[PDB]
Structures are given as C-alpha cells and as structure tokens.
Design a protein around this ligand. Structure first.
Ligand code: NDP
Ligand code: NDP
Ligand code: NDP
Ligand code: NDP
Lengths: 280, 280, 280, 280
C-alpha cells in the first residue's frame, strides 16, 4: 500500500485516481444503448413499459418482467417493431429465490445484463396506519418495495462485478423525500426513502464496477393512482408547480440518461421528475 | 364542513387553525419532565441508558427496556438516586406480539406514557453486501432497525391518541442521510433512512395528538463502536469537523429538547448531533 | 506532521482526536448560561426579544440590538427583572463598519461575547420577481439578510478565535429549504438558503474554536407576516401538519439548546421549528 | 374564479389541471434542439464551451458569452462545424445593465431564446474567511456568482414569458449542498447554495411559461481546478466514490437532458454530477 493513494470510500477502486472512460465527442452518441442488454422489472406496468420501450428505441435488448399480467405480447411487440431481442419473465419479486433464478436465466438467454431497472412496486391504499392493526399490509409493502428491490440489486450486482460494468436504476418516488397528502401512506414513504438511500449506499460499494442512481417520479398518470377520488387528485394539482400530473413519456428521458454513457460521472444521485412538487 | 378551513394534511386536526398550548414563562421550566412517564427502548445500552438517566434527572418516571442484558439494577438505580419510579422490561423488539404486551404492561404499571424513545438497534458488521449471500444479515437489520421501530410506534401511537398528547423520538443515525466509509453497511444505512422518513410520515398522521421527531447521532463513543480498529476510527476523526467522536452526554440535551415542552412546535424534524460530519 | 493524524476538514484542529469537553453529568445544568455573554441581533423584534429574554432567564448577560425601534427599555427590563447586565445598541447591519464598531464596543462593555445570534432580517413583500424591474428590493434583501449576517459572523468569529470558545446561531427560515406559497418571494428564499449553507461552511472553518448552527422557523406569529391576508394565512395553516402558526415562545428552547453546553457535539446543523411544514 | 381549481403555487397557471405537451414517439428525438436558440454564459471557459458545443451538436443555434477571453473563434467554429448560427458576446455579468443589453441583442440577433444556461462564475481561493478582512473577495463572489445569476434570470424570464416557453439551467456546484475540504471557501459555498434555491424558487414563479433546473457538478478537470496541488487533488479523489475527477464531456448529457423536451415534467430539480461525492 506504500506508493498508492488509497480510497477512503472503497479500496477496491485500486490506486487512485481511477481512469475516466473514453467517450464520444458527440453528445447524441452518448445516449445510445446499441449492443447493450437491459432488464426492467415491473415492465407489464405503466412506467416500466414506457422505459422498456424507450430502451428498445435506443438500441437495447430488453428483458420484460411481469407478475400477475403476462407481458409476452409486449416483448413480442419490441422485437417486431425495433428488431431487438426481448422476452418476458414471470416472477414474484417478494420471493428471493425466484429473483435469483429469473436474473440468472436472463443472463443465460441474453448473454449479459448491462442495465437494470428495479421498478416493480405496489402502493399503500389503506389510509392512516393507526387504524390498520394487522401487520400484513405493512409487511406487503416492505417485502415488495424494499426487500424485493434489494433482492434484484444483490443478484444483478454480482453480474456487474463479474463483467466490470453496469448501470442500476432504482425507481423510488417523491414519497421517499416528502410525505404525501392528503392520502396517508407512511409504510410506502418509508420503503421509498429506504430505496433512495440504498441507491446511494450501493453507489459507494459498487463504484469499481457499476453506477447506481434513482429516479423519483412525482404523480404520474398510471393505474397505480386510480384509488384516488377527484377531490384528492385536485389537491395534488394545486400543490404541483407545473399544475398537473405527469405522463409516463416524460420519464423516459431520465431513465435513458442514467442507463447510457451520457451519465458516466453520475452515481448515487436522485433525479426528481415531479413537476416541482418537492419544491414548495 | 362548509365554513370550516379543512387541513390538506390531516382532516382529524378539525377546523383550522388549531390552538397553541400554554407554556411556562421561564425557558428552563419548559424542559421539565415531572408528572411525565417516559419509555426508552434499548436502555441497557449506551445511548438508551444516557437518555433514560437524563429523563429521570428532568423528573420523569422511566421504563427501561432490555433484551440480552438484564437492566433491573439500572431501573433500581433510577429509583434510588432520583426518587422517580422505574422498572425494567425484557422484550425482543423484532417480535410484534411481545412489543404490544410490553407497551400494554407499561401503560398499566405507570398509568400512561407521555414520551417514547424508539432507540434499540443493531449494527451491520459484515462489510460489503455483495459478498454476503445469507439474507439473514439483511433480514436481521430490517426486522430490528425498521420493523421493530414500526411496531413500537404503532402501539404507542394508540396510547397517545387515547390521551391526546405525546412525544415520540426515534433514534436514527447520520447513516440515514450519508453513506458511512470506509466500513460499508448498506443494509443499516437503508434502515436508518427509512426510520428518518417514517418519523416524518408519522408526524403528519399523528399531528392531532402527538409530535414525532428523530435524533441522528454521529459517531458516539459507546462500547459497541469502540472495539473497531485504530485506523478505522482515525479516518472517522479526519472527516469529522469537530475532530473527535461524541460522548453520550452530548446527546441527552437533544433528547430532552424533543421530549419536553421546549419543542411544542417541533415535529417531523431530524436533529443531527454528529460533530458536523454531514457537512463536508 | 509525521506522527500526527491530520484532519481532512481543518488542520488547525491540531493532531487528532481533539478532546471532548468536561460536562456536568446532570442534563439540566447543561442548559445554563450563567457567566456567559450573549448578543442577539434584531432583538427589538419578535423572535429576537423572545430569545434575548430567555437567555437572560438562563443566566446570561444580553446585548440587545435595534435599528429603527429603540429597545433601551427592553434592556433595562432585563436588568431589573433578572439582574443580568443588558444594554441596547443601534446599528444598521447592512453597514459593515457599523457592525464592526458595534460588536467591538459590546466586547468592551461586557468583556467578551460567548453566544451570538444573527437574527435581524427583512422580508420580501413585492410578489413575483418578474414584475419588479428595479433592483433596489433584491439588493435590500441580499444586503440585510445575507451580507449583514456575514458581517456579524466575520467580526464575532475573531472574538471566538481569540478566546477559543463560542456559539454562533443564525436565524434562517424554512424558506431556505422550501419555496413559500402562495406568496412568491424568491429573493428572500435565496438569501435564507445562503444563510443555512453559510452556517454549515463556517461550522467547518471555525471548529477549532466555535460551533455554528441555524434555527429555521416556520410561520411564527410576529409582525413580519402582517402583510398577509386571511385567505393567504389560511393556506399556510392547511399545509402545516400541526395546523397553526407557531408562537415565539416555541422557539426559545431551540435557541437555548444551541447556545448552551447542551449541544457541544452539535455543529453545522439546521434545527427546523415549523410545525412540520417541510415534511409534506 | 368559482368553479375553477386554483393553484396554491401560482394562480397564473390558470384553472387546473394544466395540459401536457405533445412529444416525439421516439425517446432519442426528445433530446433534439433544432429550431431552438440557446444562450450559454461563461462559454469561454471549460464547462460552458462543452455545453455550447453539445447544444450545437443537438441542433441549436448558440450564443457564446465571454468576458476577459474573446471567443469569436469559438462561435465561428460552431458555425463552420455544425452549420448552426452562432455569435460571441462580451459581457461583465456583475453589471446588470450590460446583462440586459446582451440579452436584448441576442433576442434581436437570433429571433428568440429557448434555452438559457447561467453558467459564468469565479472561485474563492483565499482560504479561511476569518483571515480575509477585505470584503472585496466576499463581494466579488456574491456579485458574480449570485447577483449576476439573478440578473441573467430576471431578464431571460421576460423573454420566456413573452413566448410562453423556455428552459433555464443554472450551473450550481456540489458546494451548494456540501462544504468542500480541505480548501475552505465559505463565500463560494454560500453563493452556490443560493443559486440552487433560487432555481427552485424561480421554478414555482415561472411555471406557467418555463422550467428552471440546476446542474451541480463535482470536481471537473477544467483548466481552473487543475493547477491546484497534488496533495489537495489526491484528497478529493480519496473522498470521491468513483475515485477520480470528472471530464467536461460527462456533464453535457445532463445539460442536454434539462434543455430539451426529454425533461418536460422536470422543474425545480438539482441534477448532481459529482462521481458520488455528496453520498459519503
Ligand atoms: N405512477 C406514479 O405516480 C408513481 C409510481 N412510483 C413507483 O413506480 C413503480 C411502477 O409503478 P407504476 O407503473 O406507476 O404502477 P403499475 O401498477 O402500473 O406497475 C406495477 C408493476 O409492479 C409489478 N409487480 C407488482 N407486484 C409485484 C410483485 N409481488 N412481484 C413482482 N412484480 C410485481 C406489476 O406487475 P403485474 O401487474 O404483472 O402483477 C407491475 O408491472 C413503482 O415502484 C411505483 O412505486 C413512484 C412515483 C409516482
Ligand atoms: N453508538 C453510535 O455511534 C451510534 C448509534 N446509533 C443508534 O443508537 C441506538 C443504540 O445504539 P448504542 O447505544 O450505541 O448501541 P448498544 O449496543 O450499546 O445498545 C444496543 C441496545 O439495543 C438493544 N437491543 C438490541 N437488540 C435488540 C433486540 N432484538 N430486541 C430488543 N432490543 C434490542 C440492546 O439491548 P440488550 O443489550 O439488552 O440486548 C441495547 O440496549 C441504536 O439504534 C444505534 O443504531 C446511531 C448513530 C451512531
Ligand atoms: N416571524 C416568522 O414567521 C419567521 C421569521 N424568520 C426570520 O426571523 C428573523 C426576525 O424576524 P421576526 O422577529 O419574525 O420579524 P421582526 O420584524 O419582528 O424583527 C425584525 C428585526 O430586524 C431588525 N432589522 C431590520 N432591518 C434591519 C437593518 N438594516 N439593520 C439592522 N437591523 C435591522 C429590526 O430592527 P428595527 O425594528 O429596530 O428596525 C427587528 O429587530 C428574521 O431573520 C426572519 O427572516 C424566519 C422564519 C419565519
Ligand atoms: N470546474 C469545476 O470543477 C466546477 C465548476 N463549477 C461552476 O461551473 C461554472 C464554470 O466553471 P469552469 O468552466 O470550470 O471555470 P472557467 O474559469 O473555465 O470558466 C469561467 C467562465 O466565467 C466567465 N466569467 C468569469 N467571470 C465573469 C464575469 N464578471 N462576468 C462575466 N463572465 C465571467 C469566464 O469568462 P472569461 O474567461 O472570458 O473571462 C469563463 O467563461 C462556474 O459557475 C463554476 O462555479 C461548479 C462545480 C465544479
């Protein structure tokens, strides 16, 4: 160790400074995913499908994930429309063996995984915690939205380390930074705050072989928010600086930014796409 | 509800504005805890014992909690030295049924609970997650440092709501806001970030009847974190603006601040006591 | 330098670790300001007078500051009521020579300054910036609320360094963390965010001889908010988890905490007293 | 206003909800800037030139700004290489009258301004503030790094509001969120924190007609910060999770993200590009 500058963050970086990637001098080339394999969980759903389709547009092979809604037709659509390889996989991400077995099969079928989006999740819809005496629903949120995200990260991390490269994006939420109102949802906020800081912690630990970042969406027009009445949505609009909910298409730019070589010095960051909601 | 100003945060506040409490004319009397009962989990250990003793000095009856290290002589020390009432209770906070019984008994023994400090926890010590394939380590952290905190909160909140008053303090960590180095501990950091934001979420939901805040200590010279290696501690000191670890006696003022009527407008706050560590 | 652990933050700490203060084992004694001199700017106003009176209650000599409203009668009241030394000083804090001359005279009249509260400030009341084409009002906010705070800090810092001890508290605002609505006040928010990060920066630089912290109040019932109509206050209440504005008396506990030996490991922190406003 | 949902943030949004834009079907086309005019201050220097060239690659007409280092050959390089239109402008951004004239001329020369990057700035280099008694250093930082940014924003916002569209990007710094060490620079950190929160405040006020975001770079290998000392840089590397400084080419993707229609729901956001530095 004499004769080396040793990192205070992660000695597995080796003697410092590490060396910067060789990048195209053209900014547009940086956003390409040509020759790359992406795996997007929760990709039978709103945000996941938008991101998955966009990764296919950028040139990537895409592994689609679903649980209770088969998305084989979505994978088939990606191959016929963009000519990339795509397949759909059924997995309950609360089951850690099933996560391990799904990702291991994806690595076999696609050869590798370059980009991973840990996106599947469920909401809390039962109002204030004080009145839910039964711990099933807390356990459901923690299992899927926190433990399941860690199962995906821990297994994909081993592939990134073997190959020496990778980009992990975790879908967090503004709920990891603020407390949603008027719908009270403490267990979901707790899990998403944990997701956001897990991303920062893994960014440190994986730095020799991968980048880890989060997207924190605001209110996005998907079916996840269909439990909400008109008067509750109206209050969301009143508190959003842009004055509306976002579209799933307004998120894909950030997911592509983080997945691609546009962001090779970006790690441990939280990219907020929320119409300004976290500012007031 | 015509004519009432209804909260966007919590309609159980009633028609706004809510009304402020009467408070002592003298600032020093605001910190008094006589007439109050406090319950401090993990008060076998370093921080918990310091807080428990400080609360007795302020005049509170204090319920001591332990798991593997019986603390009855601690409770009887509080009895003897300060003339308050005190009893020690054995509880595994990862078991929700035992948490409920312990809280229920304390309410029976002391009459009520005014102040609750959710402080018990364990560290992660196994280095980088990517080399730990038993999820048992991950599960143990989450079940004690996150689930167990939620079990305590869910039960004590019902007492606060019955009585219409209460202060809940959660011991989080600087690890919920930053990523510790060089000792990598992503599971612990994730759990503590969850605790910090659970605090903020419960502050909104419980606002009609209680305040909820957290203390985020830095490196504190308890027995646990003093068997780590010279070279590790030295790096912590180099990155701490005050240049040293903290004493447990440097935490008790923040815990008394949040427990007492000195902080009646303070809720959802995170008090960092870390020698400046989160600043660089 | 061989044979020393050198700080990465501030080599003027000397060889590490620095040594912890010897504190009373009784938590109540930690909050005393007996034998200490405090200087509170803006102390003809609401928050400043409450803090000043409270510091006198805790045992401190108090230097009162005013600009357009003489507060000699307030200083006289402190001496007749609590028996401490107190005098009032007229200073326009936008004037850096006047700041220097006031603090230098206070050090002569009182012997030293142990605690300094940089609290004087003015609000922006002119609505959205886009319609204020004239830069007077931006310049007014920056001069008083930012430059004036630095003039006080820079001059008091020299006294703390000479004596090797001190505590600086800056009154910031939730406006340094969030964007107030519906009253649009970008220049004030900008200055208060600067105040909050100046506190963290000075905490690093002054660490060998002083602590620096901020209080960030929410909406407090003083005359600073009298420009606001009932329908605007009502929206503030709707967005505040506690459902009301705070009282000045609800801030003094935090100002005493930071001023006293209750907080000797607390530096660079921002203590938010806002009824939970920053949580949603 | 009966029957309308009125914003709590900004009533000039009109009756809510506001309406979303039509966007390209293909994610890659979202990043296009053809048909757009961009104005990039400080584009003599490292970061500004990189951004200006990246915007021309994306198809934008680009206005170059300089002060002491004429950049007409830079603008003519953009002319020659990309076929866009480009001109360089000499302006001292600490002088508000010259900022207004420069912005006015650019509007006349190019027809409009769609994208504005407020990027010009200077560092603090004089070590700890407490030893610097000329406020000239403090004043120079504030006047260029804060006041000058506000002058650019105030003027360009009127163009955006006239046209009903626009994207403003402010170059802040990791220094607005953390305190750099070992080089102490409180004045600069304070100014950059002000820029970050000015961004957030202007995002709310301008929301009916523009987005406002900031990029917060870490240590970037520009000429300015490469003449610092070996031992200083080595400490930066040791505390950076990626183990190195960033290249200016690692920033341009974030600037293009925020400038383009890839980020139409992104406002008030701070994109950290710092190799993970703010995480430990
Ligand atoms: N939409 C919004 O407003 C925002 C959403 N988010 C987060 O975005 C993520 C996706 O949300 P969104 O697209 O909006 O909602 P959707 O319900 O449309 O997507 C949910 C996806 O999660 C999958 N999934 C759900 N449960 C499981 C489970 N046990 N095991 C494996 N997969 C499961 C679903 O699969 P299947 O249907 O096949 O069962 C589905 O593909 C979530 O993490 C959400 O918390 C955060 C900010 C705002
Ligand atoms: N020391 C430090 O530097 C810092 C500590 N913290 C947090 O402060 C809290 C206490 O830490 P500290 O005092 O330093 O450490 P200690 O090990 O001294 O205290 C641990 C306490 O937790 C109790 N406890 C442990 N496991 C369980 C369990 N299953 N069920 C119920 N109770 C349990 C222990 O009880 P018993 O011994 O009887 O088994 C003990 O009272 C923790 O939450 C820690 O994460 C946060 C920032 C820094
Ligand atoms: N009240 C609130 O809701 C909150 C206030 N704050 C901040 O609290 C601080 C005090 O505010 P508050 O007590 O509520 O309002 P007040 O108007 O009651 O107090 C203002 C004080 O500032 C002094 N002052 C004003 N201008 C100058 C000037 N050029 N030079 C020297 N002194 C000056 C005034 O002196 P004089 O009257 O003698 O001229 C007065 O003592 C301020 O920094 C405010 O920004 C932040 C969060 C919320
Ligand atoms: N380099 C880094 O690591 C980081 C830089 N930043 C910020 O990025 C911005 C540019 O930095 P960088 O490119 O690295 O530094 P450079 O010194 O290379 O760029 C400085 C630019 O500012 C312009 N400028 C300087 N002073 C004035 C002035 N009074 N009036 C008008 N224009 C002026 C200069 O113009 P001219 O040369 O023609 O006089 C130059 O174009 C700055 O805001 C910096 O604070 C933030 C994080 C890290």
């Amino acid at each position: 160790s004499m004769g080396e500058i040793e990192s205070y963050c992660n000695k597995e970086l080796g003697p410092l400074p590490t060396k910067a990637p060789t990048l195209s001098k053209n900014v547009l080339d940086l956003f390409s995913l040509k020759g790359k394999v992406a795996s997007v969980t929760g990709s039978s759903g709103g945000i996941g499908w938008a991101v998955a389709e966009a990764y296919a547009q950028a040139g990537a092979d895409v592994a689609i994930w679903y649980n209770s809604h088969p998305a084989d037709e979505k994978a088939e659509h990606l191959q016929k429309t963009y000519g990339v390889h795509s397949k759909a996989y059924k997995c309950n991400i609360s089951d850690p063996k099933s996560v391990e077995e799904t990702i291991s099969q994806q690595e076999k079928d696609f050869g590798t995984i370059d980009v991973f989006v840990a996106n599947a999740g469920v909401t809390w819809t039962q109002g204030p915690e004080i009145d839910v005496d039964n711990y099933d629903s807390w356990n459901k949120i923690i299992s899927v939205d926190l433990n399941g995200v860690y199962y995906c990260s821990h297994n994909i991390g081993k592939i990134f380390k073997k190959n020496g490269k990778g980009s992990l994006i975790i879908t967090s939420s503004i709920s990891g930074k603020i407390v949603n109102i008027p719908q009270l949802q403490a267990p979901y906020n707790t899990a998403k705050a944990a997701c956001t800081h897990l991303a920062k912690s893994l960014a440190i630990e994986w730095a020799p072989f991968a980048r880890v970042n989060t997207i924190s969406p605001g209110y996005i027009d998907t079916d996840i928010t269909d439990f909400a009445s008109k008067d509750m949505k109206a209050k969301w609009w009143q508190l959003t600086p842009l004055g509306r909910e976002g579209l799933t298409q307004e998120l894909v730019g950030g997911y592509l930014y983080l997945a691609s070589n546009a962001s090779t010095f970006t790690t441990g960051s939280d990219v907020v796409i929320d119409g300004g909601y976290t500012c007031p």
